[PDB]
């Protein structure tokens, strides 16, 4: 029976635990593995907007998410001289409304994992090889141990090892949106109180906020650049490049960058999207960022993870475990919605910053209202199936 179908879920993030939840609810018996030793606390703030709120509520975790929601009360667009150009309430500032909510990744994963306390999960575990045939998927773990599964669903992030193991370069694209993003935590030296500041130029943007940790502040950087690092993963090159890229930005960048060396959670990466004609091959399926990362410029990453988890789990249910039918339905039903949200991400990367003009209240206000309207449109641009 479906209960006895062996399903491996790789990755304890959003999509992995989410699909595990729905698989378990729909009468399957998934297992989780995780390369990290444990769920990393805090981290990047994630939006739950559009369809994802409905799914979150059905999962019975919505109130828990709200209890752990970010609490920015005020967001401000400021010029390099510190003057306020445009101010908005926190949710509106984050282009959210209605029942939509923002939460730090670590807080959400913790809630997700509590919702699946029954499902087996193994941390500090990694797959080093995958081979499949018509009957089974043979998984080789780090220590050389082998296990066979009926299905493997990989939710191991944008830099998916599984994607590289299973798919060829002709079967997926790494779409570069021509910009870099960086972030790190520093002492709240300005003494911000549940407030975010945002300064921008023609090709660059800098944010600074404090929220749940009163004596800490999260710095953010975004900028367009055709420059390519000799080693994009070299953290020292990343910092030199970031410092050099913003050396004439003004405002608080000097004060932020002076504190960058002592920050312990430094992050830097190109803004990228994953585009695949098919997220599946045989008995293996990709989900979440591994399959269709819309990049942070979209604000849809979480939304796509939840919807994907629901649909893939659902189609497997209706197919009574028949993965060939389910994976086809998974690809067909979800691609337009994914492509819609990715294109919104592409649009943001091309048009958010003003290439020729300086920003003002009217621009920031008009741009904000437009993004709020457009994001609401795309995030709800799917008629979700009802598998129950
Ligand atoms: C700076 C930044 C800002 C963002 N802002 C937003 C936003 O405002 N709104 C929004 O909706 N989205 C945002 N995102 C995107 C969002 O974080 C992700 O889309 C979302 O977390 C999807 O989660 P996932 O489970 O698909 O992937 P992840 O959450 O990345 O899952 C990866 C997990 O898999 C594990 N893993 C990795 N490799 C392996 C392996 N080989 N074997 C086993 N396990 C492995 C890792 O330990 C990790 O726990 C942002 C991302 C970044 C980087």
Curated annotation (Swiss-Prot):
GO molecular function terms listed in the Swiss-Prot or TrEMBL record: FAD binding; oxidoreductase activity
From the UniProt record, list the reaction(s) this protein catalyses. Answer: a tetracycline + NADPH + O2 + H(+) = a (1S,10aS)-3-(CONH2)-1-(Me2N)-3,3a,4,6-(HO)4-2,5-dioxo-1H,10aH,11H,11aH-cyclopenta[b]anthracene + CO + NADP(+) + H2O; 7-chlorotetracycline + NADPH + O2 + H(+) = (1S,10S,10aS)-3-(CONH2)-9-Cl-1-(Me2N)-3,3a,4,10-(HO)4-10-Me-2,5-dioxo-1H,10aH,11H,11aH-cyclopenta[b]anthracen-6-olate + CO + NADP(+) + H2O
Q: How is its activity regulated?
A: Inhibited by anhydrotetracycline.
> How, per the record, is the cofactor bound?
Binds 1 FAD per subunit; it is seen bound in two conformations.
Question: What SUPFAM superfamilies does the record tag this protein with?
Answer: FAD/NAD(P)-binding domain
| Gene Ontology biological process terms, A to Z | response to antibiotic
Q: Where does FAD bind?
A: 12-15, 34-36, 44-47, 105, 267, 289, 296-302
Cofactor dependence is on:
FAD
Q: Which portions of this protein are annotated as coiled-coil regions? A: none
Q: What EC number(s) are associated with this protein in UniProt?
A: 1.14.13.-
Q: Which UniProt keywords apply?
A: Antibiotic resistance, FAD, Flavoprotein, NADP, Nucleotide-binding, Oxidoreductase
One Pfam family this sequence matches = FAD_binding_3
Q: Report the superkingdom from the record.
A: Bacteria
Signal peptide position in this chain? none
Record text about domains: Consists of an N-terminal FAD-binding domain with a Rossman fold, a substrate-binding domain and a C-terminal helix that bridges the 2 domains close to the antibiotic-binding site. This last helix is flexible, is not found in TetX of Bacteroides species, and may contribute to their different substrate specificities. Binds chlortetracycline in a different orientation (180 degrees rotated on its long axis) compared to tetracycline substrate binding to TetX; binding of chlortetracycline alters conformation FAD and the last helix.
General function of this protein: An FAD-requiring monooxygenase active on tetracycline antibiotic and some of its derivatives, which leads to their inactivation. Expression in E.coli confers high resistance to tetracycline and oxytetracycline, does not confer resistance to minocycline or tigecycline. Degrades tetracycline and oxytetracycline; the reaction requires NADPH. Degrades and confers resistance to chlortetracycline.
Q: What else is known?
A: Isolated from a grassland soil sample.
Q: Which family does it belong to?
A: Belongs to the aromatic-ring hydroxylase family.
Name the UniProt record assigns to this protein: Flavin-dependent monooxygenase
Corresponding gene? tet(50)
